[PDB]
């Protein structure tokens, strides 16, 4: 099936041909003797950018059909009465006229609907609660299959939310074949890369050291559009290097042309150009891990080891495809940096972070929709990891009252128990600072484990933290050590950094005194 | 290019002379053309002058001009027949003299009227076919002018029909100076203009003006000067004896600028100065301490690498002067971006509107390099009442989230909050969000009160002696705003009763912390 420009979905094409188009090619005598009608429509669903329109157009070309009619669902709607039904009803006129003129010796017409789900939703049974666009659904239903029969038409619908469509449109008489187009695996990526490099290979522009196998390995959660963009970016970078070399030196042009071959362009474009939508993002770790991770004691190693064990469990287990964990500790302890570190070290193809910093001013329904979208995207991969940060800020909790949002709480409670499709695995990491409230809400038994993130509690630990940060000198270090050798401290790393920064603003002589005064003004016990 | 009498569009005419007539002036052998121009802009910018002077400069036949929708007719086939009469001479010359044919210029005024249903579409089709059809002409130029470029048919703007698109804009200061020189040269030549008038001041003053408005202003000045020699009420007169000697002073121009002509554009309103009315008077040490703390915080924000975000809270009892000192600190910060968020600008709003306004302010702040924002009257922002109690939780959560979101990489932000109810904020668990706090006290002793009264200078020595006898030996607890209110209330009565009334009010307001 890769001779038509489509690679990675041979099985889907074969099944579609067997179930839909076997009677279009079989001789017309036996198909009349049997007395069987033709399939009238099909439905295709999957993530965007995976080759649905391409397949529809190729199918249209395959059976010597006429030029297809392409429609976008959202742009049919009008605000005047009878104007959206007329738009729907205009699409069948040519087919009706041709059938009336020619009877059974007519051609084939094809209609392609894009974002079909935007105009076909379940009709309201209750009186007075009818939908806004019920008339459009009724018109489409009566046009696809009605009292007057059409036998020279084929309808192809494309969507990403197949669960919102009316069930009368999907009966064995209307759009009875359905197929899913998912992300490609290594073999499909290799096929797509081979297809998209044909012109370069033919025109003698590739290098001898270009290995499409290794590049197929490197890309992990790419769609076809991503790979095409990668190839174009690589060629552009090669052209840029050619311009650089030509403009810098008086070199002979033949060497410049020989430099047109590309092996380092691919890797350069991989890092700095292409950002997959179902892959990991390196621009978030900088935001959440800003000052690194310094080892001021043993507990950090314990936390990291526990995270590593949980990752190993989720990777290699069949009876438990879903695992959860809660990180809890006192304020300013540093729970959002360690959860990001554990997520980063997992090395899963899909990593995402959900935070309330991107939901300022939202109502609870919008927040629910955002969380649901994140999890829906998560379910399309084979290994996934998700991080839910500040569980008390997503619920809008205030001690007076108390007051909070119940919709988000129920959504979280249901989401903590739902497993992905068969064979796919997910890990969830949540961070909080008020675990008594979560115990009172009965949310703590929805998690599988808990990990404690403690504070700094001894003088030697504080001195080690200061040494690692490297701010005070030997004499000041001796003064501090003699004054805080007593192991009765209680401080967080973030607040320690803030205190150091505030202390450093004074005159050089009055700096240790200010630091010690600020430290004393702080707390000293739980 | 000022000879033609239009200023501020020299560069546009340079572009015109480059893109239009270079091929016609360039030697024919090396050549061995463009036939469309569209001028658009706001009214009164000189498009008609441009068209007329373009028609005059070229050595060609007299241009043909159609004034608006004269083509339309009630009968069938006349509207289209009217168009074909325009190109007859051009076709004749093309067919007879061939290449060696004179240029033809066609001017369309208010062309949006006829280009944009049987009549209009046929007219447009006929024009399109005639301009660019099977027979190709190379000696015709068509010029159109518009004030609403967005109402013209797209098919008319494609290459080969209307190629040179030009915009006329409001002239800048040098263009306005050129226009004033053009319109005042005639007066200057005959010594009818006074020596006190300066063109530069007029050019600086007339902001947002166009050429027509400037000429109207000049005309208004002339009329103001002229009416001095006109008598009315009983009959119209010319004076003559004094009319012969007519000088145009600066006062005439100023008066004409006040009323007769207006810029016709919007104005900007400023509110920051309103937050400090009586200024800051130093009546003690605490003000200096607060200012020093503010300077320390500002410097820490400026020179910090791993603490780009800093927050502060100002504490004090009511009528103690908290917003004024916060505004003073913000002013002394000397940051490129400074703004004040107040509940006075949001009256009758719902929670969503307040959240959107706050988010807009912070979004504007995030764009600069280093910014400072001050929020005052927190309890009013998240409207709070002790009964129940009752408040808006959405705004509280929005503030809590915004208090710990860092700006984009490499940028700095400072936040200063003011309130007079600290226990409530502590209960809401928001006092932890801030990094530090400062306290604004009241006047405690009588010496500070006497110093404040000395600085204000409302009382003389005789009454100050009695006041010192009364207050010096006791502790006091009063704000400054309320102090000024009390002083103003006391001043109303006659000089005899003032001191007794003032001290009676002071005794009424006496209290302890």
């Amino acid at each position: 099936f890769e001779k038509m420009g489509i690679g990675g979905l041979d099985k889907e094409f074969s099944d579609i041909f067997r179930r839909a188009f076997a009677s279009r090619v079989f001789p017309p005598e036996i198909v009349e003797q049997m007395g069987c009608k033709h399939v009238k429509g099909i439905l295709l669903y999957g993530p965007p950018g995976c080759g649905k329109t391409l397949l529809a157009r190729q199918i249209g070309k395959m059976l010597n059909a006429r030029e297809p009619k392409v429609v976008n669902g959202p742009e049919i709607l009008n605000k005047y009465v009878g104007e959206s039904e007329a738009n729907i009803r205009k699409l069948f006129a040519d087919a009706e006229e041709e059938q009336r003129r020619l009877g059974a010796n007519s051609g084939l017409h094809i209609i392609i609907f894009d974002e079909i789900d935007a105009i076909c939703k379940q009709r309201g049974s209750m009186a007075g609660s009818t939908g806004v666009h019920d008339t459009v659904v009724n018109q489409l239903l009566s046009k696809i299959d009605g009292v007057e029969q059409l036998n020279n038409i084929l309808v192809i619908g494309m969507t990403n939310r197949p669960d919102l469509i009316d069930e009368a449109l999907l009966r064995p008489g209307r759009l009875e074949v359905k197929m899913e187009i998912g992300l490609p695996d290594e073999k499909g990526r290799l096929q797509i890369l081979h297809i998209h490099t044909a012109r370069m290979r033919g025109h003698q522009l590739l290098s001898a050291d270009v290995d499409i196998k290794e590049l197929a390995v490197e890309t992990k959660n790419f769609s076809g559009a991503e790979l095409e963009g990668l190839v174009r970016a690589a060629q552009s970078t090669a052209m840029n290097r050619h311009i650089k070399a030509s403009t810098k030196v008086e070199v002979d042009m033949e060497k410049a042309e020989s430099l047109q071959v590309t092996r380092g362009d691919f890797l350069a474009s991989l890092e700095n150009d292409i950002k997959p939508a179902f892959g990991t993002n390196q621009e978030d770790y900088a935001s959440y891990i800003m000052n690194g991770i310094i080892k001021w004691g043993d507990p950090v190693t314990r936390v990291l080891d526990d995270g590593e064990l949980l990752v190993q469990q989720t990777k290699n287990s069949d009876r438990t495809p879903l695992v959860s964990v809660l990180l809890e500790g006192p304020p300013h302890s540093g729970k959002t940096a360690l959860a990001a570190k554990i997520a980063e070290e997992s090395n899963f193809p899909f990593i995402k972070i959900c935070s309330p910093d991107k939901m300022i001013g939202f109502s609870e329904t919008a927040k629910c929709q955002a969380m649901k979208k994140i999890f829906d995207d998560a379910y399309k991969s084979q290994l996934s990891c998700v991080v839910v940060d500040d569980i008390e800020r997503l619920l809008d909790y205030v001690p007076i009252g108390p007051r909070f949002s119940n919709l988000v709480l129920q959504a979280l409670l249901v989401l903590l128990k739902k497993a992905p499709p068969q064979g796919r695995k997910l890990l969830i990491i949540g961070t909080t600072s008020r675990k008594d409230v979560l115990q009172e809400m009965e949310m703590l038994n929805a998690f599988s484990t808990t990990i404690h993130v403690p504070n700094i509690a001894t003088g030697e630990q504080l001195l080690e933290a200061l040494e690692l940060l490297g701010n005070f000198k030997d004499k000041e270090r001796t003064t501090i050590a003699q004054q805080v050798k007593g192991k009765k401290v209680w401080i967080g790393i973030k607040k320690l950094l803030m205190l150091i920064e505030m202390s450093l603003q004074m005159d050089p002589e009055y700096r240790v005194r200010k630091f010690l005064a600020l430290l004393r003004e702080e707390g000293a016990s739980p | 290019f000022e000879k033609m009498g239009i200023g501020g569009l020299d560069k546009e005419f340079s572009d015109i002379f480059r893109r239009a007539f270079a091929s016609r002036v360039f030697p024919p052998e090396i050549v061995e053309h463009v036939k469309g121009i569209l001028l658009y802009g706001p009214p009164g910018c000189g498009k008609t002058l441009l068209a007329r002077q373009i028609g005059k400069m070229l050595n060609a036949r007299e241009p043909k001009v159609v004034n608006g929708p004269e083509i339309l007719n009630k009968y069938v086939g006349e509207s289209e027949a009217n168009i074909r009469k325009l190109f007859a001479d051009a076709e004749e010359e093309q067919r007879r003299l061939g290449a060696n044919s004179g240029l033809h210029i066609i001017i369309f005024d208010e062309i949006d009227a006829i280009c944009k249903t049987g009549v209009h579409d046929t007219v447009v089709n006929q024009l399109l076919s005639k301009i660019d059809g099977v027979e190709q002409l190379n000696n015709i130029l068509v010029i159109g002018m518009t004030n609403r470029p967005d109402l013209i048919d797209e098919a008319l703007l494609r290459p080969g029909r209307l190629e040179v698109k030009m915009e006329i804009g409001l002239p800048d200061e040098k263009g306005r100076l050129q226009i004033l020189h053009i319109h005042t040269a005639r007066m200057r030549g005959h010594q009818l203009l006074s020596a006190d008038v300066d063109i530069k001041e007029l050019a600086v003053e007339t902001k947002n003006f166009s050429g027509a408005e400037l000429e109207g202003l000049v005309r208004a000045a002339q009329s103001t000067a002229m009416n001095r020699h006109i008598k009315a009420s009983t009959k119209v007169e010319v004076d003559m004896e004094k009319a012969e000697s007519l000088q145009v002073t600066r006062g005439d121009f100023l008066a004409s600028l006040e009323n007769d002509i207006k810029p016709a554009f919007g104005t900007n309103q400023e509110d920051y100065a309103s937050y400090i009315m009586n200024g800051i008077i130093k009546w003690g040490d605490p003000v200096t301490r607060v200012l020093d703390d503010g300077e320390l915080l500002v410097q820490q924000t400026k020179n910090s690498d791993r603490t780009p975000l800093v927050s502060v809270l100002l504490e004090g009892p009511p009528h103690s002067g908290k917003t004024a000192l916060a505004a003073k600190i913000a002013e002394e910060s000397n940051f490129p971006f400074i703004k004040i968020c107040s509940p006075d600008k949001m009256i009758g709003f719902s929670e969503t509107a307040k959240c959107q306004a706050m988010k807009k302010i912070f979004d504007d702040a995030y764009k600069s390099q280093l910014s400072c924002v001050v929020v005052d009257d927190i309890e009013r922002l998240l409207d709070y009442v002790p009964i129940g109690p009752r408040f808006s939780n959405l705004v509280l959560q929005a503030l809590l989230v915004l208090l710990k979101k860092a700006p984009p990489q490499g940028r700095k932000l400072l936040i200063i909050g003011t309130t007079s109810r600290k226990d409530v904020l502590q209960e809401m668990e928001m006092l932890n969000a801030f990094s530090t706090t400062i306290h604004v006290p009241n006047i405690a002793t009588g010496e500070q009160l006497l110093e404040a009264l000395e600085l204000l200078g409302n009382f003389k020595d005789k009454e100050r002696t009695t006041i010192a006898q009364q207050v010096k030996g006791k502790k006091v607890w009063i704000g400054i705003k309320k102090l000024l209110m009390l002083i103003e209330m006391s001043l109303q009565m006659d000089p005899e009763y003032r001191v007794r009334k003032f001290l009676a009010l002071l005794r009424e307001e006496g209290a302890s912390p």
């Binding site: 605000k79 005047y80 009465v81 806004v132 | 009630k74 009968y75 069938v76 049987g118 009549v119």
Partner: peptide, 16 residues
């Protein structure tokens, strides 16, 4: 939403 209501028309004559 509610679908825009019905509206009246004006007419124009032409001679020949």
């Amino acid at each position: 939403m509610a679908e825009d209501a019905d509206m009246r028309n004006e007419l124009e004559e032409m001679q020949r």
